[PDB]
Symmetry: C2
Subunit: 527 residues, 2 copies
């Protein structure tokens, strides 16, 4: 009898399995697929980086920390990954060249860490190898036919006629989660406001967008577009360029390429090949067409329908529906892996407590559910606001600086809690982060929520037709200029600064500016 | 319509894909799997390294040359690969510690290149990406339902209802070859003498064998066992240890582990799990048991029925049955990839000429079939001779030095042709290698065939019970000491030298020894000065 059976051998499953196996619990991993296998969720963000470090140090699994830095990934996982110096955004309209005043860039500051483009076949192989090394058992090419709970534990039945007996079940799989299907956990219809279907593949011979735009020198970004994740924004959709070869002597010549389309505004074209439908969108935008001219697909194309789903319950007695099994919004802002790390941090210690005491009263896991549903709802608002804003750059510009400002604040809030636990060898300061009033919010301060609440109200009003994008942009631009908290030294309070470039000098001035600030939160976090 | 449709997205199909696509031909790759995917054939040899460079240089595909060197594989493919400094051999008997006087090592000389342990998932992905970049079209998860030939070309029918029209078909897949099935090309029963079934996986936490034997200091090998492919030899079978992490700061912690068993001596155990049957053999050999003590499988185990298969013919009107779709012997001595490289070299230019003339007369590809069948037959004896010899170390000792000696002579032969073609810029010298009387024989020299023809006759006689292994070993050990060609400075003519260690100084003397040698072949291939050796 296993302590925990985990469905899903992805990062979500194998990071948890590693944690539980290292602390001496008996784990079984089940997955219908076999490593090596392709996976999406390739771009990283500061919050993923710091919470990966938090989980690694808190639970004593060094392999998880090797994902928290571009340098450690190359050194420990594989050479086959790309760098992420920045988030890049470029507006396009049908037939037109991109207006060089309708771009945004957020260079990631060194304080949160060196972000990467994850070649997921290698990162997911790496963490599975670690999970098996720590003592996890594994069955790959394993189809779950039935999941049956009782007072003693759970019996998983496989297609091959085998059964796995355990005390607890975690479903860390995706959309086709057996637990979600078999217990009827999915919300139908979904509560989520964001709508987007997807077409994606891996390509060879993708050029840098830098080399295919005619940008006046003074409007070129501080660091190259190709050194980060490029976002090609248009009416109710966007395209990602995530290169793996964007650094000197890079071994992996592939580039991850996909398009998110609101299926309400871009209806299905089943007369077209996934490839043909993808290229029909490329042909709308001259600069994107020029970037992808030589590019050739090295995979069978994936074409989805509406990608978004939610669940009504995510915990029960002796089971947890984790992260990607519970819900999904969109690739935009690589929220998925941040959400996965937040849940693993929250679930791991509680589940180990429950196993030690042999008490599976669902009350102990009440916060895990609250965090899960909160993460999804805030993620929903962020992406829905953004898709709405894509119709009018001046409105997007507000969404951009409200979203990106939180990276540095929310980032240092976690780093502070971790350094206090590091220096004092006491896990009270990391545990203190859970004592926050807005579960799921990436910068859970009162002034930020109020600010983001207004952004959501106006965006949702634009979407309903109660306000115009011009009026909403007008109001949010006033609020930004009236703001006192938006890291002025970096230019987040300045709508005319499109390329936020955090230098060494500027972060010093942020610290000085923060020292004598009237808001307690700004002093606590940034001084 | 495509010029060529290639069935198989492994190195065999994608290396050929790259060559044809690079020369401006319209190519389609069809495979039932999708990259990334696991594959075997992980260890490399001198002949593979040198012929990879010949192919790359001859056909102008630089990516193929990046497989020909450990350093170039890490730099261009991925960091996920291991080094191969030597072939290691260690004899084991049930319940007993390994006898340190019953080991063999062959350190691979610098001249033939730096060998690797290929993590094939990254190796096969790399070349597939190259093929597509060169302009190959590909369909993955493509199941071939039907193949039919007319006078104008060939039609391939997919299970999804689609069809692919081409002028020529190459089947570069494996055992379940759609082309061999369609035309009933497989020999039943197979003509092959070698018998072996297999259990294999990838494991994490495999220790070095060096750290789990108490070998006397004077009998320890010049270079570590773990820096190469270790062969745990036993009665009518052997186990491979192929670590991907056998070098400083290596990223890939996996080690490839598998066992070959003569299915006539070890009958199937369907009452056991593949894992259980594998561990039942590990537990026979205390030293192996200590090596794998902490090792855990990271894949679903493979267990085979009997791996050897052969074809009655391998070329026809507008089709070729290529390397692994034609036949297979054994993982032993990593002959699989050498055979693939040899066929690609022979077929590529012949196929492109035929396409350009629009003439597919089977007489054009006569040498491709002769080479295909020859590679397999010689591969068959080498492994069968080795499997017979595993019963008695003194007999194996003669198989080892006859095999490993040819790997330096035959290697230098191709390398001479290669460096001469680069100097003159003239392909003549590389094509001249096809002008040998023994197609498929890795060292195609009169004296070497006679030596190997005897080793085979004796080995096959031991197997048939007409001679004892002791009697066979005695006759062969005489021939070795009567020999005048077995690279004395390296110790190939010395049965009491088990660990061959080709160093800079020893290779200088081979050159001097070769100068004014009574045999012309020895002079032509090995003869040089200590001035020309400086370069290296
Ligand atoms: Cl799924």
């Amino acid at each position: 009898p296993y302590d925990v059976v985990i469905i899903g051998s992805g990062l979500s499953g194998t990071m948890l399995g590693s944690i539980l196996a290292k602390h001496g619990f008996r784990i079984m991993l089940l997955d219908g697929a076999h490593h090596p296998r392709f996976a999406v969720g390739e771009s990283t963000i500061g919050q993923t980086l710091v919470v990966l470090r938090l989980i690694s140090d808190r639970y004593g699994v060094p392999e998880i920390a090797n994902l928290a830095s571009f340098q450690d990934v190359l050194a420990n996982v594989s050479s086959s990954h790309g760098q992420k110096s920045n988030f890049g955004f470029m507006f396009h309209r049908d037939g037109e060249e991109p207006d060089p005043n309708e771009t945004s860039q957020f260079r990631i500051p060194s304080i949160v860490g060196n972000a990467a483009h994850f070649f997921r076949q290698d990162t997911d192989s790496y963490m599975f190898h670690a999970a098996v090394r720590y003592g996890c058992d594994a069955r790959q090419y394993y189809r779950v036919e039935n999941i049956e709970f009782d007072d003693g534990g759970v019996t998983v039945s496989g297609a091959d006629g085998s059964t796995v007996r355990a005390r607890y079940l975690v479903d860390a799989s995706g959309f086709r989660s057996p637990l979600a299907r078999q217990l009827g956990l999915r919300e139908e219809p979904s509560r989520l406001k964001h709508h987007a279907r997807s077409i994606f593949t891996h390509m060879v011979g993708v050029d840098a967008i830098d080399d295919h735009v005619d940008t006046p020198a003074e409007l070129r970004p501080p660091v190259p577009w190709n050194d980060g994740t490029m976002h090609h924004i248009f009416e109710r959709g966007w395209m990602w360029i995530i290169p793996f070869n964007n650094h000197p002597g890079a071994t992996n010549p592939l580039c991850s390429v996909g398009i998110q389309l609101d299926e309400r505004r871009y209806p299905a074209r089943p007369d077209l090949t996934p490839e043909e439908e993808f290229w029909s969108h490329v042909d709308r935008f001259p600069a994107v067409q020029r970037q992808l001219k030589g590019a050739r697909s090295v995979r069978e194309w994936v074409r989805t329908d509406r990608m978004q789903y939610s669940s009504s319950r995510t915990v029960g007695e002796r089971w947890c529906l984790m992260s990607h099994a519970a819900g999904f919004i969109d690739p935009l802002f690589s929220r998925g892996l941040s959400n996965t790390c937040e849940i693993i941090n929250a679930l791991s210690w509680r589940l180990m407590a429950a196993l030690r005491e042999d008490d599976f009263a669902v009350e102990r896991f009440a916060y895990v559910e609250e965090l899960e549903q909160g993460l999804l709802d805030w993620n929903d608002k962020l992406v829905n606001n953004s898709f709405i804003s894509f119709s009018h750059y001046p409105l997007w510009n507000s969404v951009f600086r409200i979203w990106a400002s939180a990276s540095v604040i929310g980032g240092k809030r976690i780093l502070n809690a971790l350094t206090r636990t590091k220096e004092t060898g006491d896990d009270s300061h990391c545990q203190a982060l859970d004592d926050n009033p807005y579960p799921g919010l990436w910068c859970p301060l009162d002034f930020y929520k109020e600010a983001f609440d207004e952004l959501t109200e106006l965006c949702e009003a634009v979407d309903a037709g109660h306000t115009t994008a011009e009026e909403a942009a007008r109001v949010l631009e006033q609020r930004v200029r009236e703001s006192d908290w938006m890291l002025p030294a970096l230019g987040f309070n300045d709508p005319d600064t499109h390329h936020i470039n955090p230098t060494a000098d500027k972060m010093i001035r942020i610290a000085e500016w923060a020292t004598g600030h009237h808001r307690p939160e700004i002093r606590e976090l940034l001084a």
